[PDB]
Design a protein around this nucleic acid. Structure first.
Lengths: 391, 297, 70, 314, 123, 452
RNA sequence: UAAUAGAAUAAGAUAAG
RNA sequence: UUUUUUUAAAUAAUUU
C-alpha cells in the first residue's frame, strides 16, 4: 500500500519527470537491495523508469563497480541493462589514473574492446615513467584479466615493477607473479627473474601468497620445477596446519611438475586427506584427479575420497561426471555405490550433455558390466542419434 | 605430439643429388605422400602439419631448426644456415599457429663459437646423448652441460659426450631408443663404437640392443608416451625382422629418393610436444591408452 | 522546498539508527511519520533527484519499524 | 525452386506473405475451441457504444513483451543504420532521411517481428470482433508514434474516418496500445465523450493546423469546428484525458473526436495504433486504397494479402 | 622458374649464370641508395645470399653502416619495430659476411639481445 | 528453458538448425527455435567466441534480420573482439554476415577476409573448405584471398587430404565465385580420380554440376565425366537425372550414347518428376539444342498434372522452352497463363520479361495473364538490360497495352540505354514492330533516336 | 564498501559476364 | 599432374 506522498513520488519516478543523477540511482538501488519494505523491485513500471533515468545520466561520476551493480540489480528484476562504455581520454585528460580507469571499467562491466585497449596502451607508452609502484601492478593485473596479447608492454611493466623490489610487499609480489604467469607471450628471462625474486622473501608468504605462487607455477609448467622445490621445502614445516585448498593446489603442482621426491608427495597427500572433507566440488575433483595421476590411490585413500565425493555426486556438475568415472576405473577398488549414483546423475542430465561429454561418458561406461542393465544405454543411444550431427 | 613436415617443390628438385646419383622427382613426391599418410596413420601423433612449399630442396630438412631437450625448445645457432634463416621464420609461425611455444630458447645462439647441429642429440631415458664430432664443438658441449646437467638423488639429468669420427653421420641417424628399453643402432663401425661408449658411460644398467643394417634409416618416437611404432626403410627386410623379434611394430616406408638426396626420415619431420596452459589449480583431461575395468573382466 | 524536509528526516533517521534519543525511538518514528506526511503536491512536483532518493531511503527505513506497512 | 541449404530457414522478404502468425511473443494461437477465454464483459461493449471509447480492464502484454515491442520501435527509427524492410512500409517519417521531433510509421506489421505478431493478438482481436457485431476481423493498417523528449509535438483534434473516405461503410475500430507510461504531460489520449453521434454519424470539418505554436492553442482549436449545440455538450462533458500504463489498450470508435497530448517528460514516448474492419466493407472508387497495394473495382469487397483475416467466429 | 629436369634441363645452368651476372650488375651499385627501414636491407641481403650474388666489400660496408644508426635509434630512444627475429637474421648476415665490416654493429646487436629491447613476433 | 545457460542455448540452436536444414524442414522446429532465439541476449555474461558465433549464425539462419537485438549484440562482439575470432570460428561469422547487408556486416566481412588472406598458409583440410564455402556465400571480389586459398587447396590436395564431401564443397564454392583456375579444378578432378570408389552417386552429380557451371572449355574431362556417370544412371534419382541433363547442357558437347540412356531413365521415372525437374530438363534441352518430341510429349503431359506446383521460375523456363521448340499445348499454356496471373508478384526481373516474351511470341493472348504481368512490369523496369527492355517493350506492344502509368517506366529505361537499345542487330525487326504500333506520337525522343 | 575462470566439434546447386 | 607465389608501390586528369 502506497500512501499519497509515496504514491506521488513513485508516479513522478515512473513518468521520467525527475532528473536523476548516477549517485541518486545508486542510492535508490542500494536501498532497494537492502530493504524491501516498499516493494521497489515488485513494480516493473518503477524499475523501468529508474533504468530509463540510468541510461540518460552521466555515469562517469560513479565508480565502475557502482554502474555494474546498477546493471546487475536491473538484470535481476528482468531488465536488460548495460553500463555505457567510457571514452578514451584525449588532449589534457591523459593521466595514469584516467587510463587505468578505462581498463578497470572494461574489466568490471564486461565490455572488453581490443581497439580501446590498443589505444590506451599507445597513450600509456610515453607517460610510463609517471606511474606509481601500485599503479604498475594494477595495470599488470588489468591487462592480465583482459587476455591482452601485447606481451611486450607487460614485459616492460614487469621490468619496472621488479626494479622496485624493496618497495613491494609479499601480496604485490605474488599478484605480479601470477599475473605475469597468466600472460602467454612474456619472455622467459623476465619470468626467471620474477621467480628468483619470489624465491627470496619465501618465509614472508601468507596462505594467499602460497595459493598465488602455486597458481603461477601451475600455469608456467615444469621448467620452473626448481622454484617449486623451494616451495615444497618451505611448506614442509607448516603442512600439519594448512588450508585444504592450498593442499589441493600443492597436489595439482606435484602432478604437473612430475615431482620425483616421493616422501614429500606422500606427506602432502596424507595431510590433505585429513581435511579433504572441507573441499568444494571443483577442488575435490581436481584433488581426486591429482591423486590418481601420482599413483597414490590406495584402499584407504580411495575409500576416504569417494566417501567425500558421494556427497556432491547427487547434484554433480556435468563437467565432473566423466572425470570421477575415469578415476573409478583403472583401479582395483570397490566403487559400486559411487558409480550407481554417478550413472543416475548422468541419466538425469542426458539432455544437456554436450557431444564430447556424452561420448566420454559412454566410452568409460562401455566395458562396465553393471551399465548394460540400465536405462542409460537406451537413453544415450537416442541422444547420440540426435547429436551425431554435432560430433 | 604434433609432427611438422614440408611438401617438396617439384620445379626445383635437383636432377642429381650428392655423389651424382640421379633421382626421380615423381617418385620423390609419391614417397613423400606415402610418408605423410604413414605419419597420419600413427596413433601417437595428435596432428600432422604440412607447411607450404619453398624453392630450395634444403628446406625439407625441417628438424634442423631446433631441438627438444626436456621441456626446453632450444634453437640451433644460425651459423651455417644463413640462407635458411627466413625459412626458419616461416616454420615458427606454424608452431605458433598450432598453439605451441611463442619462441625458442636462444641459449645456443648467444654463445660464441658454439657450433651445434640438431640431430647429434639423442634423448636417452633420464638424459641426453650428444656427439662430439665435426658438427658440434666443445663449447656447445660445455654450454649444454652447464644448462641441462644436474646431479641429484632424484632430480638427475645426464649429458653424455659420445665421440665420433669425421666421416660419421649425425648421431640421431644411427643411434636411438625404441619402446622403453630397446636400443636401435647400425651394425657399422660408428654404431658399435657409440653403443660401446654409452655402455661405458652408463654401467650397471640392463637394456636391449638391436642392430639394423647400415644405411637403413629409422624413426622412432621415444618419449613420455610409450609406443612401439618404428618406421623403417622398405628395402631392408632383416632390420624389420630384428625389430619385430625385439617386440616392436615395424612400419616399412619407401624412402629411396630422399635417401639418394641425403635426407633421412628423422630430419624430414619436426615432432614437438605441446601442452595447454592451466589457469589456476586446474587439471586438464588426458586421453586414455590402457584397459578399463581390468578387475571385473 | 523538499530537500530540507528530506535532510531533517534523514537526521531523525540517523538519530534512530544510532540510539533512541531523549524522547524515545517510538516518538522519533511518530515525528518521522508526521514530517513525511507533511509533503504537499507543490514540493513533490518540483523535487530534484537527491531529495526524492533521500525521502525514499528514509521511508523505506522507517517502514521496517512501523507496525503498519505504510 | 531450390532454396539454398543456408537459406532454408529464412523468412519472406515482406512479412505479409507469412500466412498466420509467427511464434515470437505469445507462442502460437490457441485452438478453435479455445478462443472463448478472451471474451470481454457486455458492460465493456455497452460503455464503448455509450462513450465512444473504452479502456480494457487488463493489460494486454507482459512487461518483457512490451520491452521487446518498444525495441522494435526504437530500431524502426534508427536514422543511422536504417531499418531493413523499410521499403515495406506504407509511409515513414524518415523518407526525408532527417526525421524530426515526431516519428510516425505505417504498415510496420510487414517489417518487424512482434509487430506482425501483435496483429493476431487474441486479447484485442476478440474484443474487436465483439465491437464489430461478431464478424470477421480484418486488419486495416498499423501506425506507430514516437515523440521525443521535451520537444515532442501534439496531434490536434481529428476523426479517424476522415482519412478513410475511400471505404464505403463505417465499419472500423481503433486499438491504441501504450508502449510506455503516459500522462497529460507525455502523449496521453484526449477524447470527447459521446462525440461519435453528433452530426448524425457524420464527419466534422477538418481542423486548421498551424505548426510552431503552443500546445494550448492547438488543443483549443476545437471551438472552431463545432456548432452551438456541440458547444453545449462540450460545456456539459468537457474532453477527458485517459492515463495509460505500460501495456494498457484503448478501443476507439472511428467517429470519436480524438487528440494526443505533447511530450514534456525527460524521455521519448511510444504508442501503437491498429485499425480493424469488419467483413462487410467495400470500396468506393477504382484503384488501390494504400500505396502499392491490390487494386479493387467499384464496390469491391476489401480482401487480400494486405488485409489479412485475424479472427473468425465460425 | 628454372627446372633442373625439364625439357631444357641442359640449358638451365647457363640461365642461372646469366641471372646471377645481371644480379651482380645491380649489386655493384648498392652504396648510392638510402635504406628507410630494416626490411629493405633484410630483403636485399637475403636475395644476395640466397642466389650467391657477389657484392663488393664497399657496398656491404655502407649497407651495414646504415642499419647501425637505425638499431642505435631503436635501442637508445626506446620511446618512438625491429622484432627479435629480424635482429637475429641481421646478426647471422653480419657473421656470414664477416664481423670486420662493421665492428660496432656486432657489439651493439649482441647487447640488444642481452638487454631484450627487441620485441617478439607474437607481440 | 530459463535454467539453460547461453552456452547451452547456442548448442541447442545449432542442433535445431542442423535438424532443420538436412533432416526435413519441419516448421515446428523452425518456430520453436525462433521463439527461443527471440528472447536471448548476450549481456552481463562472459561467453566464448564460438558461442557468440553460433548464436549469431543460428539466429541469422532462422530469418532474423540486422535490426534484431541478438544479431546486433553478436555483431558488436565480433567488432570489438576481433582476434578472438580464430580460423575455427571465422567461417561461422562470415556465413552469418553473408546475407546481412549493413555497414557493420561489411566491415566484419572485410576484416575476416583480410585475416583469412594473411593465414592462408596455415590452414588444414577442414579450414580451407569451410572458409572458402563461407566466402562463397557472401559476394566478395578479393581475388588475392581466393588465389591464396586455391594455392593452399592445391598444396593439400597433392598429398591426398580431401574426401568426396570436401571435394564437392570446394568445387561448388569455387564455381560460385566464378574463379576460373584450370589447375585448381584439374587437381580436384584428379583427387576424385584417386579417391575412386569413395565418390558415390550422391557425391558425383554435384561435382559434375560444379565443373560444368565454371565453364573450363576442356573436352578431356567432360568425356571422362560422361563415361564415369554412364554406369551410375540406373542408380540415379529423378532429381539427379535432371541435374545431369542440365550439367551436360552446360558443357555443350554432344554425347548421344549418354543422352539416350538419360532419356530412357527419365522416361522410366516420369511419374516422379516435379515441376522443377520438368523445367530443368526442358531448359537443358533448349540450351543443348536437341529436339526430341518423344520425351517432350511425356514431359508436357506430366507438367499438365503438376500445374499448381509450378513456381514463377518454373513457369518462365517451361513456357520459354515450349515456345522455342514450337510445341503447341493449348490446355497447358492456358493453365500456365492463369497460374502466372495468380502469382504475378513472385516474378523477378528476368522471369517476368522471359514469361511475357514467351507468351507473346506464340499467338497466345490472355487478358488475365497480360494485365497482371503488364501491371507488375512497373517494379522491374529499373533492373533490366537494354535488350531485356526491348524484349519487354515488344511483348507489351503485342498485348496492346496503352496505359501511360505502365509505358512511362519502360520508355524511360529504354531511353537511358538508347545506345545499346539501337545497337543490337538481332532485335532490329522487333524495333520496326514496336514503332509500328505506338507510332511517332508516343515518346517523340525515342522516335527521333530511331530515325537517326 | 564490494571482481575468480574449466569445455575444443566439417553440408553440398542463384537462367553470367 | 607439374603451372605458377615474397613491394611502403600513389605520375592518369578535370570542370562532373
Amino acid at each position: 500500500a502506497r500512501p499519497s506522498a509515496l504514491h506521488l513520488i513513485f508516479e513522478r519516478c515512473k513518468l521520467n519527470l525527475v532528473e536523476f543523477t548516477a549517485q541518486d540511482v545508486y542510492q535508490i538501488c542500494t536501498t532497494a537491495y537492502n530493504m524491501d519494505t516498499l516493494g521497489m523491485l515488485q513494480d516493473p513500471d518503477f524499475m523501468r523508469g529508474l533504468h530509463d533515468a540510468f541510461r540518460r545520466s552521466d555515469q562517469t561520476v560513479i565508480s565502475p563497480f557502482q554502474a555494474n551493480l546498477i546493471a546487475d540489480t536491473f538484470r535481476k528484476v528482468g531488465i536488460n541493462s548495460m553500463p555505457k562504455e567510457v571514452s578514451v581520454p584525449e588532449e589534457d585528460a591523459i593521466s595514469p589514473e584516467s587510463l587505468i580507469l578505462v581498463l578497470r571499467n572494461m574489466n568490471i562491466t564486461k565490455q572488453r574492446d581490443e581497439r580501446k585497449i590498443n589505444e590506451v596502451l599507445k597513450l600509456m607508452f610515453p607517460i610510463l615513467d609517471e606511474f606509481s609502484p601500485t599503479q604498475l601492478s594494477l595495470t599488470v593485473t588489468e591487462l592480465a584479466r583482459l587476455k591482452s596479447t601485447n606481451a611486450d608492454f607487460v614485459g616492460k611493466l614487469a621490468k619496472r615493477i621488479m626494479e622496485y623490489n624493496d618497495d613491494l610487499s609479499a601480496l604485490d609480489i605474488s599478484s605480479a607473479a601470477v599475473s605475469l604467469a597468466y600472460c602467454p607471450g612474456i619472455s622467459h628471462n623476465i619470468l626467471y627473474r620474477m621467480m628468483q625474486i619470489v624465491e627470496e622473501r619465501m618465509g614472508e608468504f601468507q596462505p594467499e601468497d602460497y595459493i598465488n605462487v602455486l597458481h603461477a607455477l601451475n600455469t608456467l609448467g615444469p621448467k620452473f620445477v626448481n622454484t617449486f622445490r623451494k616451495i615444497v621445502e618451505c611448506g614442509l614445516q607448516h603442512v600439519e596446519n594448512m588450508d585444504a585448498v592450498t593442499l589441493t593446489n600443492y597436489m595439482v603442482c606435484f602432478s604437473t611438475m612430475d615431482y620425483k621426491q616421493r616422501e614429500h608427495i606422500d606427506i602432502y597427500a596424507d595431510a590433505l586427506v585429513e581435511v579433504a572433507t572441507d573441499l568444494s566440488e571443483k577442488d575435490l575433483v581436481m584433488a581426486f584427479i591429482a591423486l590418481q595421476r601420482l599413483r597414490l590411490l590406495s584402499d584407504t585413500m580411495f575409500g576416504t575420497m569417494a566417501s567425500c565425493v558421494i556427497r556432491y555426486a547427487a547434484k554433480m556438475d556435468p563437467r565432473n561426471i566423466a572425470p570421477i568415472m575415469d578415476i573409478c576405473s583403472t583401479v582395483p577398488h570397490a566403487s559400486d555405490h559411487l558409480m550407481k549414483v554417478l550413472m543416475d546423475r548422468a541419466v538425469e542430465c542426458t539432455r544437456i550433455l554436450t557431444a564430447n561429454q556424452l561420448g566420454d561418458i559412454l566410452d568409460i561406461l562401455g566395458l562396465y558390466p553393471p551399465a548394460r542393465e540400465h536405462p542409460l544405454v537406451q537413453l544415450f543411444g537416442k541422444q547420440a542419434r540426435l547429436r551425431l550431427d554435432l560430433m | 605430439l604434433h609432427a611438422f613436415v614440408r611438401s617438396p617443390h617439384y620445379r626445383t628438385i635437383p636432377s642429381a643429388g650428392p655423389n651424382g646419383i640421379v633421382v626421380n622427382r615423381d617418385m620423390l613426391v609419391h614417397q613423400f605422400r606415402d610418408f605423410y599418410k604413414t605419419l597420419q596413420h600413427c596413433s601417437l601423433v595428435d596432428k600432422v602439419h604440412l607447411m607450404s612449399e619453398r624453392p630450395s630442396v634444403e628446406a625439407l630438412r625441417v628438424a634442423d631448426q631446433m631441438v627438444s631437450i626436456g621441456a626446453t625448445f632450444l634453437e640451433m645457432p644460425l651459423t651455417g644456415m644463413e640462407h635458411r634463416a627466413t625459412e626458419f621464420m616461416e616454420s615458427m609461425r606454424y608452431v605458433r599457429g598450432a598453439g605451441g611455444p611463442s619462441t625458442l630458447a636462444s641459449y645456443l645462439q648467444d654463445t660464441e663459437n658454439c657450433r651445434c647441429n640438431s640431430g647429434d642429440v639423442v634423448c636417452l631415458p633420464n638424459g641426453i646423448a650428444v656427439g662430439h664430432g665435426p658438427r658440434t664443438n666443445a663449447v656447445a658441449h660445455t654450454t649444454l652441460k652447464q644448462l641441462f646437467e644436474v646431479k641429484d638423488d632424484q632430480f638427475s639429468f645426464d649429458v653424455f659426450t659420445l665421440e665420433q669420427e669425421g666421416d660419421a653421420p649425425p648421431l640421431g641417424d644411427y643411434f636411438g631408443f625404441a619402446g622403453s628399453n630397446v636400443l636401435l643402432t647400425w651394425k657399422d663401425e660408428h654404431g658399435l663404437l657409440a653403443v660401446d661408449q654409452y655402455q661405458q658411460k652408463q654401467p650397471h644398467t640392463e637394456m636391449n640392443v638391436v642392430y639394423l643394417e647400415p644405411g637403413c634409416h629409422f624413426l622412432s618416437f621415444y618419449g613420455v608416451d610409450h609406443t612401439i611404432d618404428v618406421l623403417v626403410q622398405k628395402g631392408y627386410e632383416r632390420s624389420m625382422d630384428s625389430i619385430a623379434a625385439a617386440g616392436l611394430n615395424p612400419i616399412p616406408v619407401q624412402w629411396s629418393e630422399m635417401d639418394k638426396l641425403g635426407i633421412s626420415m628423422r630430419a624430414a619431420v619436426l615432432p614437438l610436444k605441446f601442452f595447454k596452459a592451466n589457469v589456476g589449480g586446474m587439471l586438464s583431461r588426458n586421453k586414455s591408452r590402457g584397459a578399463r575395468w581390468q578387475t571385473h573382466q | 522546498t523538499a530537500l530540507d524536509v528530506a535532510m531533517r528526516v534523514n537526521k531523525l533517521k540517523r538519530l534512530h539508527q544510532t540510539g533512541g534519543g531523549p524522547s524515545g525511538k517510538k516518538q522519533v518514528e511518530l515525528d518521522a511519520w508526521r514530517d513525511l506526511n507533511n509533503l504537499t503536491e507543490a514540493q513533490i512536483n518540483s523535487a530534484e533527484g537527491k531529495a526524492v532518493s533521500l525521502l525514499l531511503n528514509s521511508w523505506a527505513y522507517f517502514a521496517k519499524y512501523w507496525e503498519k506497512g505504510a | 525452386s531450390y532454396v539454398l541449404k543456408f537459406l532454408r530457414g529464412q523468412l519472406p522478404e515482406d512479412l505479409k506473405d507469412v500466412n498466420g502468425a509467427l511464434g515470437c511473443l505469445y507462442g502460437t494461437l490457441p485452438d478453435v475451441d479455445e478462443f472463448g477465454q478472451f471474451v470481454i464483459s457486455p458492460d465493456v461493449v455497452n460503455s464503448f457504444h455509450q462513450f465512444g471509447y473504452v479502456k480494457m480492464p487488463i493489460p494486454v502484454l507482459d512487461h518483457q513483451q512490451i520491452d521487446k515491442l518498444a525495441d522494435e520501435v526504437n530500431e524502426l527509427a534508427n536514422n543511422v543504420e536504417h531499418h531493413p524492410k523499410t521499403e515495406r512500409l506504407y509511409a515513414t517519417s524518415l523518407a526525408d532521411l532527417t526525421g524530426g521531433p515526431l516519428f510516425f510509421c505505417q504498415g510496420q506489421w510487414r517489417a518487424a517481428w512482434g509487430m506482425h505478431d501483435l496483429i493476431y493478438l487474441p486479447t484485442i482481436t476478440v474484443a474487436a470482433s465483439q465491437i464489430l457485431n461478431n464478424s470477421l476481423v480484418r486488419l486495416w493498417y498499423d501506425e506507430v508514434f514516437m515523440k521525443a523528449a521535451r520537444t515532442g509535438p501534439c496531434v490536434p483534434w481529428q476523426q479517424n474516418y476522415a482519412r478513410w473516405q475511400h471505404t464505403k461503410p463505417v465499419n472500423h475500430v481503433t486499438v491504441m496500445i501504450a508502449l510506455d507510461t503516459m500522462n497529460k504531460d507525455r502523449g496521453a489520449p484526449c477524447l470527447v465523450p459521446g462525440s461519435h453521434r453528433w452530426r448524425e454519424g457524420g464527419l466534422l470539418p477538418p481542423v486548421s493546423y498551424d505548426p510552431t505554436k503552443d500546445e494550448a492553442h492547438q488543443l483549443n482549436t476545437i471551438w472552431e469546428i463545432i456548432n452551438e449545440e456541440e458547444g453545449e455538450m462540450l460545456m456539459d462533458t468537457p474532453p477527458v484525458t485517459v492515463d495509460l500504463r505500460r501495456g494498457e489498450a484503448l478501443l476507439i470508435h472511428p467517429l470519436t473526436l480524438f487528440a494526443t497530448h505533447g511530450n514534456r517528460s525527460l524521455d521519448a514516448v511510444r504508442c501503437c495504433f491498429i485499425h480493424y474492419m469488419g467483413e462487410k466493407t467495400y470500396a468506393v472508387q477504382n484503384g488501390p486504397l494504400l500505396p502499392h497495394t491490390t487494386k479493387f473495382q467499384a464496390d469491391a469487397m476489401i480482401q487480400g494479402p494486405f488485409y489479412p483475416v485475424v479472427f473468425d467466429p465460425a | 622458374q628454372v627446372s633442373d629436369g625439364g625439357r631444357n634441363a641442359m640449358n638451365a645452368e647457363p640461365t642461372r649464370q646469366k641471372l646471377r651476372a645481371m644480379g651482380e650488375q645491380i649489386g655493384c651499385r648498392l652504396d648510392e641508395v638510402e635504406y628507410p627501414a630494416l626490411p629493405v636491407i633484410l630483403s636485399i641481403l637475403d636475395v644476395v645470399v640466397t642466389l650467391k650474388i657477389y657484392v663488393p666489400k664497399k657496398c656491404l660496408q655502407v649497407i651495414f653502416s646504415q642499419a647501425n644508426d637505425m638499431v642505435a635509434i631503436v635501442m637508445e630512444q626506446k620511446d618512438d619495430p625491429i622484432t627479435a627475429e629480424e635482429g637475429r637474421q641481421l646478426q647471422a648476415l653480419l657473421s656470414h659476411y664477416g664481423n670486420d665490416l662493421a665492428p660496432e654493429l656486432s657489439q651493439r646487436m649482441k647487447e640488444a639481445f642481452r638487454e631484450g629491447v627487441l620485441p617478439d613476433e607474437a607481440s | 528453458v530459463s535454467h539453460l545457460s547461453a552456452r547451452n542455448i547456442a548448442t541447442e540452436a545449432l542442433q535445431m538448425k542442423k535438424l532443420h536444414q538436412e533432416r526435413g524442414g519441419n516448421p515446428m522446429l523452425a518456430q520453436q527455435a525462433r521463439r527461443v532465439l527471440f528472447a536471448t541476449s548476450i549481456a552481463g555474461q562472459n561467453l566464448d567466441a564460438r558461442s557468440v558465433a553460433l548464436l549469431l549464425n543460428t539466429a541469422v539462419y532462422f530469418g532474423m534480420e540486422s535490426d534484431a537485438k541478438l544479431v546486433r549484440e553478436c555483431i558488436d562482439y565480433c567488432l570489438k573482439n576481433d582476434k578472438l575470432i580464430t580460423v575455427d570460428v571465422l567461417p561461422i561469422v562470415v556465413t552469418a554476415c553473408a546475407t546481412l547487408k549493413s555497414r557493420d556486416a561489411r566491415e566484419v566481412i572485410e576484416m575476416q577476409a583480410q585475416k583469412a588472406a594473411r593465414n592462408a598458409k596455415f590452414l588444414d583440410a577442414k579450414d580451407v573448405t569451410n572458409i572458402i564455402s563461407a566466402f562463397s556465400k557472401t559476394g566478395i571480389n578479393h581475388e588475392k584471398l581466393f588465389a591464396f586459398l586455391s594455392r593452399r587447396v592445391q598444396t593439400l590436395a597433392r598429398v591426398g587430404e580431401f574426401e568426396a564431401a570436401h571435394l564437392v564443397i570446394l568445387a561448388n564454392a569455387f564455381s560460385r565465385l566464378r574463379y576460373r583456375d584450370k589447375f585448381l579444378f584439374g587437381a580436384i578432378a584428379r583427387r576424385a580420380m584417386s579417391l575412386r570408389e569413395r565418390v558415390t552417386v550422391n557425391e558425383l552429380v554435384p561435382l559434375i554440376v560444379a565443373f560444368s557451371k565454371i565453364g573450363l572449355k576442356d573436352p578431356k574431362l567432360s568425356k571422362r565425366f560422361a563415361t564415369k556417370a554412364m554406369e551410375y544412371v540406373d542408380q540415379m534419382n529423378a532429381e539427379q537425372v535432371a541435374s545431369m541433363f542440365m550439367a551436360f547442357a552446360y558443357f555443350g558437347i554432344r554425347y548421344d550414347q549418354l543422352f539416350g540412356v538419360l532419356t530412357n531413365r527419365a522416361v522410366e521415372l516420369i511419374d516422379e518428376f516435379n515441376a522443377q525437374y520438368i523445367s530443368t530438363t526442358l531448359n537443358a534441352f533448349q540450351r543443348i539444342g536437341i529436339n526430341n518430341p518423344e520425351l517432350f510429349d511425356n514431359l508436357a503431359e506430366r507438367a499438365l498434372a503438376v500445374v499448381q506446383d509450378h513456381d514463377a521460375r518454373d513457369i518462365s523456363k517451361t513456357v520459354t522452352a515450349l515456345a522455342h521448340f514450337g510445341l503447341k499445348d493449348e490446355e497447358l499454356f492456358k493453365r500456365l497463363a492463369s497460374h502466372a496471373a495468380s502469382i504475378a508478384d513472385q516474378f523477378d526481373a528476368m522471369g517476368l520479361v522471359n514469361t511475357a516474351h514467351a507468351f507473346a511470341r506464340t499467338n497466345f493472348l490472355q487478358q488475365d495473364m497480360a494485365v497482371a504481368l503488364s501491371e507488375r512490369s512497373v517494379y522491374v523496369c529499373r533492373l533490366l538490360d537494354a535488350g531485356e527492355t526491348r524484349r519487354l517493350l515488344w511483348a507489351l506492344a503485342k498485348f496492346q497495352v496503352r496505359d501511360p502509368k505502365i509505358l512511362t517506366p519502360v520508355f524511360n529505361r529504354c531511353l537511358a540505354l538508347h545506345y545499346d537499345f539501337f545497337a543490337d542487330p538481332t532485335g532490329s525487326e522487333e524495333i520496326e514492330e514496336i514503332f509500328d504500333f505506338y507510332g511517332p506520337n508516343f515518346c517523340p525522343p525515342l522516335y527521333q533516336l530511331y530515325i537517326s
